[PDB]
Ligand binder design. Structure first.
Ligand code: BLA
Ligand SMILES: *[C@@H]1O[C@H](CO)[C@@H](O[C@@H]2O[C@H](CO)[C@@H](O)[C@H](O)[C@H]2NC(C)=O)[C@H](O)[C@H]1NC(C)=O
Ligand SMILES: *[C@@H]1O[C@H](CO)[C@@H](O[C@@H]2O[C@H](CO)[C@@H](O)[C@H](O)[C@H]2NC(C)=O)[C@H](O)[C@H]1NC(C)=O
Ligand code: EIC
Ligand code: EIC
Ligand code: NAG
Ligand code: NAG
Ligand code: NAG
Ligand code: NAG
Ligand code: NAG
Ligand code: NAG
Ligand code: NAG
Ligand code: NAG
Ligand code: NAG
Ligand code: NAG
Lengths: 371, 98, 285, 49, 49, 49
């Protein structure tokens, strides 16, 4: 409404806006082994897939734009656009080669021979799946029979499980006794990759990057440039990809070596280990304290007093100090003139303090008379 | 204990309201910053919508409980005013009223 | 080179009570002065744990035990007798298996197609000319092929002298194979106790997380034999076992109420669904 | 989604139960006043008993 | 090129989605793509794109 | 005033109930007609739920 009746109204708590932004990422300069992971002359078979650990590097991933071109690039648990702003805790690249028709099977909650017997993904899977055609590398005239896949298995694989055994699969009821024959098949079969081959039955190189976010220390970071650390000021911070706003202060907490963030009963981040200098900083919101507006009718006047509860007025956390700053027991009242007299309550401030609009004309605050 | 119950009930209600901020309410996380840091603006809005609905529901439950408690306290205070009028300001003939 | 050990005296399996032991940090987030409720694979409170000895007086036990959803492995030692584990399904080179060993120089972890022996063990030889002990036998596996994962720690030299007296070191481990990850949580405490698991509470911290990607259903402990001139006969009988003991319990999916103190340590916990009083405590937080 | 909906159902039930408990408490306070003032005594209040 | 057709969509990254053509996901509208071989490709390479 | 308040609150309450119809509640729109005209029966059911 455009008119406010006489009284005291609760407004939003006192707000402080961030003065500046800071980014604090771990101090590391090496580029991640994109050449070794993607530009590899020899990929692994899907049944025996190659897991490589990536650590202590920067995930710039703009160097792949010059040469690489990926048929599929699907990220789960994270947006593609935020990858430049994040740090990744423990990063594993799972590399293999499969058929072009089977790239759809490299995804959470899939079925098929690849998803069941060769390579299974969880659904609590934060990561990305990258696949690109390699018909000009992994296929040769007459057939490339070097890439194998498991065609028979007694049960589906668990997520991120590997099975490199070559025991004869007993499809039938009779024992196989470790020799092929009727209803006794060799579990692994080789892909036939040729250059004159259908696109669905052509080789595809697949890399699955699995990682976690914002729970543990990170040694793999995006290309964001770090910034100096400023304390005792409400600022926007980006600690290992964890964004936020607040005041950073020195902390007495002693994190264990395996801990990066501290959390409170509300699961919000209360403390953080600074990645550059191994020190603990407490994070505190910079908005705090209640504010009330005491007004007569807007028709009567546009003058208003502001009661900032829980601030001492005897640099203050007020919108405008102005004049007539009086420390009541209910907070600091600004814009009202204190008078030694006492009358009946008109606008109850609280704690035995009331206010009124009196005669030139201004808002007065006084101690209410009991009788 | 009858007044300590009031004090403890109010304090426990506020502490429960603070504790209830740790629920996902179906979102990927219970923390705004985690959602905004791992998701872009696009689906961060969907997750924050779920969080907003859940926390607004928590506040509404708190306010409803407070309204019922305030009705109880109003009944007790009406009784107290009646006793003030009829036993301090007078002499009550009502049996076991004072 | 492996040799079976025959000079044994069979006994029934001993049993012990685990007094609020086997709690570990569920995640890597610092928490202080809070009552945090978490559901995970925990060792139930006051559960019955199997007890295995290694004494001469000769009794020593390294059987192949199940691996049901994870294992809590405590070891009371004074001379470093228990020095690793084997994990797998068949343990016969038809499938991949995990080997963790501390061979007195390095900690070696290997996911590899091992052909394990019926009685795998390490062996330290007493020297009479010079009173010095050093490992002389390593009879764990006979073959190793298609050998996927390998980690070797930095060199060291630990005191493997056979001590006489009371058990000094309690080493507690929690192993779990989840989503192709072998998580090991570890704790070490000093104690002075003769027979059973010590009382009290001690929270195990995350030690390592190995991406083995292996099916695991059985495991076996690797004990170290003392060999000396006092024991005659061939290698199958000329040996003795140093005094040591270990305890094996099995994790189950349980809800716990952990208490983080002001310094961020889990001082105590309440096992919900242990008894109705514990359920009441968990409900009241 | 099912958990959220059923928890909302339980909260609605508990709120209605609190309201009806307040009503029953008012009725029981009236009954106790009547027991004190009419069974344990004689009430001069008009039409009270 | 074909491999970049996936990048013409909201919330994407790559060459096209970062340096050439960007979409919101408050994007009411829709994307149509069809293979243009033997129309935009000539022997020796079409370097006009 | 005690009587007038009893009127005002009720009216205010009813007015609030109308205004709260202008909330998405997570849906793509707060209007049934917009959802049913932009989305077919397929996912308009989810939005309307
Ligand atoms: C078996 C694999 C194995 C694990 C998982 C292991 C964990 C482990 N033990 C340690 C200490 C140590 N570890 C040992 C020996 C052992 N502690 C044990 O749990 C076992 C089974 C032994 C071998 C018998 C000793 C003697 C110390 C130093 C104790 C001290 O001087 O206080 C350390 C600290 C090393 C450091 O300070 O950098 C780790 C990480 N050590 C191992 O050998
Ligand atoms: C992991 O290993 C166990 C034991 O080898 C497998 O369980 C066996 O599976 C076969 C057929 O599925 C059964 O005939 C056996 O009775 C099972 N034995 C036991 C102890 O469970 C299990 O299938 C393996 N898991 C995976 C994903 O391969
Ligand atoms: C303990 O295990 C490690 C690794 O198996 C051994 O270290 C290796 O020893 C051989 C000797 O033939 C060397 O060729 C290797 O280069 C060593 N690898 C390392 C240090 O990583 C070590 O010798 C073993 N120690 C004992 C007492 O058995
Ligand atoms: C003979 C008609 C089929 C009747 C099947 C009836 C019910 C089962 C539905 C099964 C899904 C289709 C199976 C084909 C996909 C398996 C191969 C793969 O995805 O890799
Ligand atoms: C050497 C492996 C390091 C992987 C880095 C770790 C975590 C972050 C994953 C980041 C993006 C991976 C490469 C993206 C390829 C698609 C590029 C495109 O869209 O055109
Ligand atoms: C580089 O990393 C180390 C890690 O301790 C840190 O001390 C140092 O400040 C970093 N360099 C700069 C310029 O901050
Ligand atoms: C990958 O390989 C091609 C050809 O070998 C080369 O042109 C390109 O520079 C390489 N890219 C990276 C990141 O190594
Ligand atoms: C304010 O006071 C004037 C009398 O001077 C009156 O006309 C007016 O109605 C009042 N404003 C409102 C919103 O009632
Ligand atoms: C802070 O406020 C209280 C009254 O609430 C007052 O007694 C005290 O003097 C104030 N602090 C200082 C340093 O004056
Ligand atoms: C109010 O009374 C005090 C004495 O107690 C005096 O110091 C002060 O000047 C008076 N202020 C006003 C506005 O009268
Ligand atoms: C005894 O040792 C041999 C090899 O040394 C082994 O084949 C055999 O299995 C062992 N005995 C038993 C009962 O396993
Ligand atoms: C383990 O302990 C419990 C209670 O002491 C007992 O019931 C059980 O029989 C014990 N286990 C075995 C195999 O005896
Ligand atoms: C000292 O110990 C080593 C360990 O084998 C042994 O070879 C050597 O013979 C001993 N010294 C003498 C003089 O025997
Ligand atoms: C496993 O070992 C055998 C023989 O050592 C070999 O033929 C086979 O290629 C190996 N398979 C893998 C996945 O290493
Ligand atoms: C916590 O850490 C401090 C070191 O500042 C120490 O004085 C205190 O004894 C510790 N308290 C507990 C319960 O660990």
């Amino acid at each position: 409404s455009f008119t406010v009746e006489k009284g005291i109204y609760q407004t939003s708590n006192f707000r402080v806006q961030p003065t500046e932004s800071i980014v604090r990422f771990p101090n590391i300069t090496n580029l991640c082994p994109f050449g070794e992971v993607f530009n590899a002359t020899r990929f692994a078979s899907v049944y025996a897939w190659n897991r490589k650990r990536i650590s202590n590097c920067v995930a710039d991933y703009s160097v792949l734009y010059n040469s690489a071109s990926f048929s599929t690039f699907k990220c789960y648990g994270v947006s593609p656009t935020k990858l430049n702003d994040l740090c990744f805790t423990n990063v594993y690249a799972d590399s293999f080669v499969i058929r072009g028709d089977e790239v759809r099977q490299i995804a959470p909650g899939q079925t098929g021979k690849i998803a069941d017997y060769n390579y299974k993904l969880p659904c609590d899977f934060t990561g990305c799946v990258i696949a690109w055609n390699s018909n000009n590398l992994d296929s040769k005239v007459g057939g490339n029979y070097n890439y194998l896949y498991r065609l028979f298995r007694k049960s589906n694989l668990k997520p991120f499980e590997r099975d490199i055994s070559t025991e004869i699969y007993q499809a039938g009821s009779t024992p196989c006794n470790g020799v092929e024959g009727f209803n006794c098949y060799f579990p692994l079969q080789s892909y036939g990759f040729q250059p004159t081959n259908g696109v669905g039955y052509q080789p595809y190189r697949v890399v699955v990057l699995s990682f976690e976010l914002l729970h543990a220390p990170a040694t793999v970071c995006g290309p964001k440039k770090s910034t100096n650390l400023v304390k005792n000021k409400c600022v926007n911070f980006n600690f290992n990809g964890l964004t936020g706003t607040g005041v950073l202060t020195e902390s007495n907490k002693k994190f264990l070596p395996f801990q990066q963030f501290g959390r409170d009963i509300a699961d919000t981040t209360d403390a953080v280990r600074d990645p550059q200098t191994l020190e603990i900083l407490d994070i505190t919101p910079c908005s705090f304290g209640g504010v009330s507006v005491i007004t007569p009718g807007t028709n009567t006047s546009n003058q208003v007093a502001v009661l900032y509860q829980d601030v001492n007025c005897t640099t203050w956390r007020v919108y405008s100090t102005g004049s007539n700053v009086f420390q009541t027991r209910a907070g600091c009242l600004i814009g009202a003139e204190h008078v030694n007299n006492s009358y009946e309550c008109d606008i109850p401030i609280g704690a035995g303090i009331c206010a009124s609009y009196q005669t030139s004309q201004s808002i007065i605050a006084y101690t209410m008379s009991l009788g | 204990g009858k007044l300590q119950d009031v004090v403890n009930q109010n304090a426990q209600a506020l502490n429960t309201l603070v504790k209830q901020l740790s629920s996902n309410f179906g979102a990927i996380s219970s923390v705004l910053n985690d959602i905004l840091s791992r998701l872009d603006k696009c689906e961060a809005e969907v997750q924050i919508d779920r969080l907003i609905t859940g926390r607004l529901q928590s506040l509404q439950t708190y306010v409803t409980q407070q309204l019922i408690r305030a009705a109880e306290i109003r009944a007790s205070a009406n009784l107290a005013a009646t006793k003030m009028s009829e036993c301090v300001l007078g002499q009550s003939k009502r049996v076991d009223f004072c | 080179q492996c040799v079976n050990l025959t000079t044994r005296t069979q006994l029934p399996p001993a049993y012990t009570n685990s007094f609020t032991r086997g709690v570990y940090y569920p995640d890597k987030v610092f928490r202080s002065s809070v009552l945090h409720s978490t559901q995970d694979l925990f060792l139930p409170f006051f559960s019955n744990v199997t007890w295995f000895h290694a004494i001469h007086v000769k009794r020593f036990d390294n059987p192949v035990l199940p691996f049901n959803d994870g294992v809590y492995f405590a070891s009371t030692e004074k001379s470093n007798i228990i020095r690793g584990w084997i994990f797998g399904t068949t343990l016969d080179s038809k499938t991949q298996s995990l080997l963790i060993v501390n061979n007195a120089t390095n900690v070696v972890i290997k996911v590899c197609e091992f052909q394990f022996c019926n009685d795998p063990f390490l062996g330290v030889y007493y020297h009479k000319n010079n009173k010095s002990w050093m490992e002389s036998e390593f009879r764990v596996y006979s073959s190793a092929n298609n050998c996927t994962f390998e980690y070797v720690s930095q060199p060291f030299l630990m005191d493997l002298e056979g001590k006489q007296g009371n058990f000094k070191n309690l080493r507690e481990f929690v192993f779990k194979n989840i989503d192709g990850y072998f998580k090991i949580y570890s704790k070490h405490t000093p104690i002075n106790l003769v027979r059973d698991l010590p009382q009290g509470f001690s929270a195990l911290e995350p030690l390592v997380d190995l991406p083995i990607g292996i099916n695991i259903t059985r495991f076996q402990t690797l004990l170290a034999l003392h060999r000396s001139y006092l024991t005659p006969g061939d290698s199958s009988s000329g040996w003795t076992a140093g005094a040591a003991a270990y305890y094996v319990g099995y994790l189950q999916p349980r809800t716990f109420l952990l208490k983080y103190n002001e310094n961020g340590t889990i001082t105590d916990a309440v096992d919900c669904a242990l008894d109705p009083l514990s359920e009441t405590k968990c409900t009241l937080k």
